Amino acid sequence: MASETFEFQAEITQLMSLIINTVYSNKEIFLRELISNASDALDKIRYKSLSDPKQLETEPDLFIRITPKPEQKVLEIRDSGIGMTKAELINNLGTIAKSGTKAFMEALSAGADVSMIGQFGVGFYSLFLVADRVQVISKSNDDEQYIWESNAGGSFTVTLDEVNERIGRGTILRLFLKDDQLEYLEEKRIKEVIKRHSEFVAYPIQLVVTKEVE
């Protein structure tokens, strides 16, 4: 119920401000970045399960699932990967200095394509190209379900999850899309972006479509 507030490491806030304000054209690369991250999480739970089979029992199916929520202007990207504990959301998503953050900003100033973000290990922050707010909902086998939330400012919140659907195991990236980026709520657009940049994915990519009967 009670939210804990944490400060972002200085260089991460600069990077987030850069990306949320950019007039850069090829904004669709955010999906490639989030599918790769999702695929890495799925590799980690699969690799871990080789010597610990019981790790998969909290969520036996290994998948990536994309759910547009047009009514809320939300796009969700779920995976049944390793997930993150409260301590892993705090360290990995904001407080610890990520190797590559300042160097990616340096490559960007020199002329690099924002598309290179994933080679610097900070591809997660590409979501701010299309979203002005994000909730990272995660369930690790080692902890309770938690919500990490950011709006590209200097601080983020972490809250024990008592409001969202139960994840058996994994992470949900809940993107609150910008008014000009509502095209990523469309099935044809989503399918087009997936086929173009995520051809070699070892896990099924599912698209959740809502349709009116007759």
Ligand X SMILES: CN1CCC/C=C\CCCC(=O)Cc2c(Cl)c(O)cc(O)c2C1=O
Find the shortest distance in angstroms from Cβ 138 to ligand X: 6
Q: Which stretch binds its own copies (CB under 8 A): 20-28, 39-47, 117-125, 159-167?
A: 159-167
Interaxial angle between packed helices 29-49 and 187-197, expressed in degrees from 0 to 180 and rounded to the nearest 10: 70
Residue 99 near its own copies by CB under 8 A: no
x/- site string to its own copies, residues 45 to 84, per CB under 8 A?
----------------x---xx----x-------------
Q: Are 150 and 12 spatial neighbours (Cβ–Cβ below 8 Å)?
A: no
Whose CA is closest to 89, among 169, 148, 174?
A: 148
Q: Which of residues 187-206 bind its own copies (CB under 8 A)?
A: 190-191, 194-195, 204-206
CB-based contacts of 85, cutoff 8 Å, min separation 6: 140, 142, 143, 146
What b/e string do you get for 188-201 counting C-beta neighbours within 10 Å, with b at 16 or more?
eebeebbeeebeee
Report the residue from 2, 5, 54, 212 that binds its own copies according to the rule CB under 8 A: 212
Taking every pair of Cα atoms in the chain, the longest distance, rounded to a whole number of angstroms, is 54
Report the residue from 8, 30, 104, 124 that binds ligand X according to the rule CB under 6 A: 124
DSSP state of 92: I
Rounded CA separation 92/84 (Å)? 9
| Residue 171 assigned to a binding site | yes
Amino acid at 75: L
Find the shortest distance in angstroms from Cβ 89 to ligand X: 8
Query: Going edge to edge, which strands form the sheet with 4-7?
Result: 4-7, 155-160, 146-150, 131-139, 170-177, 74-79, 64-69
Query: How many residues sit in the footprint of its own copies (CB under 8 A)?
Result: 24
| Residue 111 assigned to a binding site | no
Q: Which stretch binds ligand X (CB under 6 A): 50-58, 74-82, 145-153, 197-205?
A: 74-82
| Residue 121 assigned to a binding site | yes
Binding site membership for ATP: which residues?
33, 37, 79, 84, 92, 98-100, 119-124, 171
Residues that bind its own copies (CB under 8 A): 61, 65-66, 71, 162-166, 190-191, 194-195, 204-214
Binding site membership: which residues?
33, 37, 79, 84, 92, 98-100, 119-124, 171
